[PDB]
């Protein structure tokens, strides 16, 4: 599952991404909006535009929820609940879309964080987010 030591590569890779989590969670919306245009469908009320203050304002939100997960990770179920009813009850996001933000998020740790982004850590971050999206998709299953 998410083992003793994956829960350490993430407590730590996020450790150092700090004061920035918000510029990062918005650099990764930008990247998902640009590369997989098919996700634009949901932010019809966003300037999915590049300086856009809405996407900048939402990075802060995706990044605030990533962190509550990094903290509370031995129990995502509980903490991420209302983002797992909103995403799955109120908005109906096709779950293949979590795979892809999941990936732009990592193309972002990657591009802002090179020495801490070792291969073992590239696996734990990935294991971490494959778990955020399983929680995010569960009123589903």
């Amino acid at each position: 599952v998410l083992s003793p030591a994956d829960k350490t590569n993430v407590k730590a890779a996020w450790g150092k991404v700090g004061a920035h989590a918000g510029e990062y969670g918005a650099e990764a919306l930008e990247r998902m909006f640009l590369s997989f245009p098919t996700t634009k469908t949901y932010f019809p009320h966003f300037d999915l535009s590049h300086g856009s203050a809405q996407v900048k304002g939402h990075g802060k939100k995706v990044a605030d929820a990533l962190t509550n997960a990094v903290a509370h990770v031995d129990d995502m179920p509980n903490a991420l609940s209302a983002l797992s009813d909103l995403h799955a009850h109120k908005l109906r996001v096709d779950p293949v879309n979590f795979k892809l933000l999941s990936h732009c998020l990592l193309v972002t740790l990657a591009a802002h964080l090179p020495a801490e982004f070792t291969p073992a850590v590239h696996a734990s971050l990935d294991k971490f987010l494959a778990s955020v999206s399983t929680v995010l998709t569960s009123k589903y299953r």
Binding site: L34, V107, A110, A111, H112, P119, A123, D126
Partner: protein, 146 residues
Amino acid sequence: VHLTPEEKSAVTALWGKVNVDEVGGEALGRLLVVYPWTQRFFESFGDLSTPDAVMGNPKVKAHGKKVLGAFSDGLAHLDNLKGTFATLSELHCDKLHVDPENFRLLGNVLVCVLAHHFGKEFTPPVQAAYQKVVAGVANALAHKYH
């Protein structure tokens, strides 16, 4: 493909800044570490059990050169992306039977690695173009499941 004159170029211009022989394999390395089932297919290969013993498999470093190999034949033959690859797809598909979405994990991680190495200059309109080649190289090797 399509690549718009202007995608074509952010792409063509990261690539020869690209140290193939040692990217080819930070990528195959990272694929057997992040996505393990892929290991099933490289037991012709060595100790693949702790991450350090892969990324330094002279054998995982070697096959990976073959493979930045054919992104190269693609990164520019983007015109049949479909025929540069008939033989390998014959190879990957009805020979080893790799399921086609292990084709996307690989171009996908290849991008994590294009990004890890060029940092800030893998702007996003510049990644966006690589998800296109990649999704292209992957629709190509998979063309015999039909």
